[PDB]
Design a protein around this nucleic acid. Structure first.
Lengths: 228, 335, 228, 335, 48
DNA sequence: TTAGCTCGAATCGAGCTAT
DNA sequence: ATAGCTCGATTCGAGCTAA
């Protein structure tokens, strides 16, 4: 039939078929960009929904592995004993004052990493609140591990506009955020046709590259970066 | 109109074996038949992060925490013994005839036209230049991929095996014959004529190729690597696996075929970058660049289509490239 | 002489003149948009940078009053008694579940307002940090009181692009943020020549309007809004 | 605009082998070619509670109960014989040449620019300072990591093995040449010129390095430590595993390479620590911190990007650091 | 099978070292002799 | 919701200016 | 840093089809 696109994934069929048993079949192969993930030989009587359901489990385990691999590192607020956790915050980056630390009784509250060699500093509740406000991780911060560092940088001279494939990580129904393209255009105050022009395939004449402010505000409003 | 056939499966000519690699001492390399094999063993490695950071890991505390929790791996490593300084790599090569004949085809007319085209090539200019270039990638130990970079002295021994016995023996100083130039030499000419007779189908050619190299005393040698399933823990991760046949480190036969295949000096870019393995679309994975792009009219498929379908014969260099692609085989044809 | 423009302020001179004493004199009038704040008769020997210094104190008083009357609401974290303030955070909006509350002993932590009829909500430290991350106020959040409510709204259908004078509140040498046009363009990842078209006034040839995503991302980066 | 390449893999120069540990007596080290190897064996250790307790295990009853159940485990231990006080450690070092040439490069223009940058470095000042510091780390037994801390006399012998034979011999007092200062000496200068000729690619050099350490009769020696899968019973836990190749205690080759790499004295922090290994982000595993932070604009990647992309050549010390990091090799470039 | 110098009586190595280094509370000369002897014997001191 | 496409109008970058 | 310009290329919105 025709290729099935699910966010960044693509299920393209083989050009020539085969017969398994007495029924016609085609091999359907799953991609993640250029990475081939799995191949399945499927009957020609399957619709697109059944072909998608055949690879839904592999897509789901990819999503789970991506969430666990790129999960933001967690800071823990502990008491003077260092045993009881009073609050946990997931941060996009660590404070620059983190050094090797074991809590004392000289200070009541300590902020520590969840990593086994713990880094930390004595912290007050006001300072902990300020650090959590200016360092917290958005709920979909794991998607940033699937994107290159030259599309996620705030330096305008080192920034590159994301491609269509990098856009489809966060913009489609089969993407990792689950919002539609029209919802993404509504978040940016943009026309749906203009935003479709951003995620247009290579077989198109009208393609537009998203700007710095629009891309970063989209990442903010989607809960991927710079949302705390 | 003579459209292209929908399957063009070709079988591989110049079929090598897995090259088994063993160790010993120089000047006892004549009696190297009982040299102990190079074994693949495991060692533990610890390191810090030396790759580029994502600009998200540039935070100093994350870098310090990554240093304080370094990554631990166990790797397969191949070494020479601490009393041996020479590595012996041995494989057998078969030169087969009938290069232009496909193993599968859909069109009798297309396969007849292709056979006629290959036949008029062989009649006009046989497998003389191609076999000359193949003899070289055997006379220089290009199949010693990373075992040749810092080796002090490399020599190769090619024996023509007929009824299981050496019919003619060749000995080459593999460092004298470079990896860049296809010069002319009498023993190289004889080996080229033998490979040409093998490619023409006029005789059976089986070669025993043995290479010795001064890597050093106890130094690391480099066999071929396998995939990592990554189904274990992150401390005993087994990040590298090496290739072994029956407990002897070895190099994949396709790596040897690629090494002998590096004869393409006719791509539209400058040949001062060196010879390339003949491929459709002139692909080099290390450089990430495709010489002979399909946008230019110098790739294998457009050349084969123009030469066969509409009788647009390319230059003799480009048809050498086409016949080299036919010799290497491949699943050509549309779908 | 010339009309001195200091951000949203404009010191325009009188077209006619006068001779107070014997020296030449002109009437300089401070403006906050269409609002007149002061008339000061000054000599013609003063330079522009000296009339600016002459009118600087009234502008400083205006900025102090604007910062004080539009200060964001402060929340207080207290113990099970309500006497000791353990941590305070300024919020752009109050929590949704606030009701009139007096702290008791059954809960250790209480999040009360700073207003004397103290609304409150029993929280733990983790929920308090979640609320602080969600509801925090940027340092220059007081400038939103000087801006219309239809240019700060996140609803794209009810949003109106800011004018040049409303844009001078946040960008410019004499703005309330103090950032130049080049720095604002670098924050938006665009050229300074295009931002000058945003800040252009009375020049009908080549004057542009800012977009929803660009305006809200600029407010994010300057520290005015969306910086919870 | 000449952006950087995504694939920037480099191969390492200064390839060391695994260093084998043998044992014997001082003043018979001139006939140490038949010294018996140091054997890794098993012994039992019994331990008490000696680690910190997290305010809940500090109860006297719980602490005493933990005392009544001590941890029993076996450890791999390497010791000298009771009649031998000298430890012999021997490895071979090969210096390749061609440091500025990457093994894989996506961009041809970036490849050419990097080659011109490295050629400009070598033309301005060759591999003379770097080779001098590498020869210093060869002369002192820094590769003898914990076997040098209490050794009374350490002597390092370095030979140049040309055709399997000692073409040039060096004998050094590894304690007179400290681990802090890179001074000047005539024999150090000769070894520096040899390593310089190796790094420049002028000729093939292979160095056999042998170090003798007078430690004491029956004293503990310290080979490299391996990884434990941690699956067996608690009593036979094997909490410590030592590295050996064939019943002979050995040091990992990458540990030797790290100790030879300790030439970096140009990091922004003070000279209290002394030289460190030339790694990107200046990582030291023992201190758990990174000298040459990317925030301080003195790491390898920022210096290389400024030097190559936009012609901002750093100080000659940082140029030495960058070239030593290219000699070190690694998977640079954005993955 | 018992522990003299329990952490409860504040005479173990860890509490004495922490008070001597962090709080600058130098213990008795006997207790600092004990601490320096613990530094001589070596160890894997320092938890997470 | 996906996936596009004209068509005139507004915007964008990078050149210059002026003060 | 302010203030503004031109000019060709790119983006943008609101129609539309196509599924």
């Amino acid at each position: 039939m025709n290729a099935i696109h699910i966010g960044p994934f693509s299920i393209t069929p083989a050009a020539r078929g085969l017969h398994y048993g007495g029924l016609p079949h085609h091999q359907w192969t799953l991609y993640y960009g250029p990475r081939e993930m799995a191949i399945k030989t499927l009957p020609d009587s399957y619709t697109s929904s059944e072909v998608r359901d055949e690879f839904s489990d592999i897509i789901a385990e990819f999503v789970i592995d991506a969430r666990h691999r790129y999960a933001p590192d967690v800071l823990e607020l502990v008491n003077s004993d260092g045993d009881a956790v009073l609050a946990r915050v997931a941060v996009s980056r660590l404070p620059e004052a983190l050094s090797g630390c074991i809590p004392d009784d000289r200070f009541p509250y300590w902020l520590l990493t969840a990593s086994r060699p713990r880094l930390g500093l004595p912290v007050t509740l006001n300072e902990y609140t300020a650090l959590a406000v200016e360092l917290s991780a958005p709920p979909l911060a794991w998607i940033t591990g699937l994107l290159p560092g030259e599309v996620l940088t705030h330096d305008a001279e080192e920034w590159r506009p994301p491609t269509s494939w990098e856009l489809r990580h966060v913009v489609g129904e089969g993407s990792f955020t689950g919002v539609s393209g029209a919802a993404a255009a509504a978040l940016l105050g943009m026309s749906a046709t203009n935003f479709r022009k951003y995620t247009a395939g290579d077989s198109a004449a009208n393609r537009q590259k998203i700007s710095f402010a629009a891309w970063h505000y989209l990442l903010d409003r989607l809960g991927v970066k710079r949302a705390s | 109109i003579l459209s292209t056939a929908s399957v063009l499966a070709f079988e591989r000519k110049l079929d090598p074996s897995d090259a088994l690699m063993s160790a010993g001492a120089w000047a006892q390399r004549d009696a190297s038949q009982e040299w102990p094999a190079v074994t693949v063993r495991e060692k533990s490695v610890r390191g810090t992060i030396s790759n580029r950071l994502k600009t998200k890991d540039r935070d100093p505390a994350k870098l310090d925490a990554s240093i304080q929790s370094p990554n631990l791996q166990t790797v397969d490593v191949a070494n020479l013994p601490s009393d041996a300084d020479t590595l012996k790599v041995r494989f057998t090569l078969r030169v087969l005839g009938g290069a232009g004949t496909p193993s599968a085809c859909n069109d009798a007319a297309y396969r007849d036209k292709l056979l006629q085209t290959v036949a008029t090539y062989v009649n006009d200019q046989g497998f003389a230049e191609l076999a000359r270039r193949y003899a070289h990638n055997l006379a220089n130990a290009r199949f010693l991929w990373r075992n040749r970079v810092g080796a002090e002295a490399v020599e190769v021994r090619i024996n023509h095996i007929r009824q299981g016995e050496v019919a003619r023996a060749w000995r080459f100083d593999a460092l004298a014959i470079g990896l860049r130039d296809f010069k002319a030499d009498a023993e190289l000419d004889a080996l080229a004529e033998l490979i040409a007779s093998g490619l023409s189908g006029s005789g059976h050619v089986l070669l025993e190729v043995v290479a010795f190299a001064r890597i050093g005393d106890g130094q690391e040698v480099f066999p071929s690597q396998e995939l990592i399933l990554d189904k274990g823990d992150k401390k005993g991760q087994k990040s590298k696996t090496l290739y072994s046949v029956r407990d002897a480190a070895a190099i994949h036969s396709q790596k040897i075929g690629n090494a002998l295949r590096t004869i393409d000096t006719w791509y539209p870019d400058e040949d001062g970058l060196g010879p390339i393995a003949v491929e459709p679309y002139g692909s080099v994975t290390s450089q990430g660049k495709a010489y002979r792009q399909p946008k230019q009219k110098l790739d294998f498929y457009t050349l084969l289509d123009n030469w066969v379908l509409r009788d647009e014969a390319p230059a003799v260099e480009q048809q050498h490239y086409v016949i080299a692609n036919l010799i290497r085989g491949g699943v050509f044809g549309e779908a």
